[PDB]
A paper describes a structure:
Here, we demonstrate that MavC actually targets the Ube2N–Ub conjugate to catalyze an intramolecular transglutamination reaction. MavC-catalyzed transglutamination proceeds via an obligate thioester-linked intermediate to form an isopeptide bond between Gln40Ub and Lys92Ube2N. Architecturally, MavC1–384 is composed of three distinct lobes: a core globular domain (CG) flanked by an insertion domain (residues 128–225) on one end and an α-helical extension (HE: residues 33–66, 356–384) on its opposite end. Ubiquitination of Lys92Ube2N, located adjacent to the E2 active site, effectively inhibits Ube2N activity and attenuates downstream host NF-κB activation.
The MavC insertion domain can be expressed and purified on its own, and a crystal structure of the insertion domain shows that it preserves an identical fold to that in the full MavC protein. An analogous NMR titration using purified MavC insertion domain (MavC128–225) yielded Ube2N spectral changes that are remarkably similar to those observed with C74A-MavC1–384 despite the large molecular weight differences. These observations suggest that the MavC insertion domain is primarily responsible for binding Ube2N, a conclusion supported by similar Kd values obtained from BLI measurements of Ube2N binding to MavC or the MavC insertion domain. The insertion domain appears to behave as an independent Ube2N-binding domain but when built into MavC its rotational states provide specific functionality during the transamidation reaction.
Author numbering: 128 to 225
Write the structure that this text describes.
C-alpha cells in the first residue's frame, strides 16, 4: 500500500483531484501523503521543517523522484541528508499502512 515516490510541488499547482495518487508531496510549508483514494493526509511537519527540506532539494533529478534511494548518502551533501530525512519521516508515518 505504501508510497514509493515523492515530488516537490507549489501550493497553487497541487490539485488532489488530478495529481498522482499514492504519492508524497513536499510543499514549502507542508508535507502530505495523497493516498490511494485521493485524500490529502498531513504528515505532521512544521512549516519551518518543510521550508528547509523543500529548499535543500535543488537537483532537477530529485524534484520528482523515489523515496528510498539506496544510493543517497546523507553525509555527502545537505540535499541528500534532506532526502534521507524526508524518507525517514515518511517511513515512520507509513508504519501501519500495511
Amino acid at each position: 500500500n505504501a508510497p514509493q515516490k515523492y515530488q516537490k510541488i507549489k501550493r497553487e499547482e497541487f490539485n488532489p483531484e488530478t495529481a498522482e495518487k499514492n504519492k508524497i508531496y513536499l510543499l514549502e510549508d507542508q508535507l502530505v501523503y495523497l493516498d490511494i483514494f485521493g485524500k490529502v493526509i498531513d504528515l505532521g511537519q512544521t512549516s519551518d521543517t518543510c521550508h528547509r527540506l523543500f529548499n535543500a532539494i535543488t537537483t532537477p533529478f530529485y524534484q520528482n523522484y523515489i523515496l528510498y534511494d539506496e544510493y543517497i548518502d546523507p553525509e555527502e551533501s545537505a540535499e541528500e541528508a534532506a532526502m534521507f530525512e524526508m524518507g525517514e519521516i515518511v517511513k515512520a508515518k507509513m508504519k501501519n499502512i500495511d
